[PDB]
Amino acid sequence: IANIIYCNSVINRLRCDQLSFDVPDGFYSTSPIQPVELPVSIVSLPVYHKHTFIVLYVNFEHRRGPGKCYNCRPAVINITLANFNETKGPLCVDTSHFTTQFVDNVKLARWSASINTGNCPFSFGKVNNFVKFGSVCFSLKDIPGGCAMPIMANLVNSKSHNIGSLYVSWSDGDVITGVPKPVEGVSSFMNVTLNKCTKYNIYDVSGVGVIRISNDTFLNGITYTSTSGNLLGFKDVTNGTIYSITPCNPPDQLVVYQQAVVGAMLSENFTSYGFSNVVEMPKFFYASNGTYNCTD
């Protein structure tokens, strides 16, 4: 070890990211740190709404008898998928909305049951994040051409065991959608927060941004997107107001000279990066410790 630099200050952060102890004079890009405590905003179209529950039950029986072992495998394993039946056919959902809940009815202590992702393009618990399907069917018996989800049982700090599987057939489409739950009156149609960086899922497009009110009367459609595909705005199919969406930490530019940050061009009207003076230029705000008492 020859020398070290802590990535704690603004100049040291830029040095750490540029991965060099000396930084030439110039204008460098930078992004502020994102807030981590993030509210959730949901907007959705009110639709024909019937709802089913894809409930998976797991419980396994430990042989109570002569050998009083605890760090072994259980004797028997019933897995169930609610209204499923092997002799009538694989179970799947026709209603627009549905949820998946995993019930771990294992009674033993220092024990648990779990589910892995397997080779499937989605997890069992992540379907509740407004995922689209055209038809998805579950079955404890194998479905040809489908995906397999291994089931697990875990002793704390001990070798885990596989006790079954779960086969899902999926053909992604826009007919049915998964939701976390039918809520007790709390609306999933318009519930948003404003002027605060939030993680949103607005008309089935998800991301992180800031929602504001607008001034436009755009007549057509309900979602407005950029060429990159990102969500720029949306409309509430009620009054009809337009809203706008913007990332909460847009890039800035830092002016560095003589291995020190002398200024910063900002998108907005504030005194960022510890500078005591900010002025407005025709197309950006600029903050620095200067006094404008200079000629060169």
Epitope: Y70, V103, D104, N105, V106
Partner: antibody, heavy 124, light 106 residues
């Protein structure tokens, strides 16, 4: 590992209390929890319960209609929101920690507790 | 659902084979646990599944059963025991402990 409680005292019948509990040294959000009490010179009886996800809460028969339970998974806090005390709530409380770690989405069984804090006494 | 612990308190010396029977008022068949209460302390865990020694405690405790007769016993009491013991079942969402027992100085 460290466990601690807060918020015990003396209030009138029918009042309110913010019983609190804090933890450190383990994954708070994945373990089940249950508040258990002990009247002075009496046995121990279960009061309330909560799974790692926090989807559902479980209450005792005599406790029903009086106290409610919640946590905050963001910064390792756990509570009993207390209301409507009668006369016999005088006891010491514990935020006993359930042994089993469970997946963050599952609703699973519970009921065996490893570590207990310092205990917090309350009276009415 | 309840459990009766009897006798309520017994005094014992260094070396005796103390025993407590936790009548769970009905058959639970393995879901139980025990705790150690040295006076003035928060309860600590002793036994779980009515069989498994908590590794924070020395191995000089044991218990077994099948039905309602589930027990807890001491091989040979060591002088610092002088504590209260409580049992509980973990079969049901509505779990109820017992009345307790004691071992006392002698």
């Amino acid at each position: 590992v460290q466990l601690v409680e807060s918020g015990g005292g003396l209030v009138q019948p029918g009042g309110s209390l913010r019983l609190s509990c804090a933890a450190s040294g383990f994954t708070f959000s994945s373990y089940a929890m249950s508040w258990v009490r002990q009247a002075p010179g009496k046995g121990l009886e279960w009061v309330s319960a909560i799974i790692g996800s926090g989807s559902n809460t479980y209450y005792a028969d005599s406790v029903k209609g009086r106290f409610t339970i919640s946590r905050d998974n963001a910064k390792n806090t756990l509570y009993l929101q207390m209301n409507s005390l009668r006369a016999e709530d005088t006891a010491v409380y514990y935020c006993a920690k359930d042994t089993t770690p469970r997946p963050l989405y599952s609703s699973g069984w519970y009921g065996s507790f490893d570590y207990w804090g310092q205990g917090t006494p309350v009276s009415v | 659902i309840q459990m009766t612990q009897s006798p309520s308190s017994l005094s014992a010396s260094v070396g005796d084979r103390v025993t407590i029977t936790c009548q769970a008022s009905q058959d639970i068949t393995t879901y139980l646990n025990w705790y150690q209460q040295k006076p003035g302390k928060a309860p600590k865990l002793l036994i779980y599944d009515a069989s498994n020694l908590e590794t924070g405690v020395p191995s000089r405790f044991s218990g077994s059963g099948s039905g309602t007769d589930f027990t807890l016993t001491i091989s040979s009491l060591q002088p610092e025991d002088i504590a209260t013991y409580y049992c509980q079942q973990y079969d049901n969402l509505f779990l109820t402990f017992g009345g307790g027992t004691k071992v006392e100085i002698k």
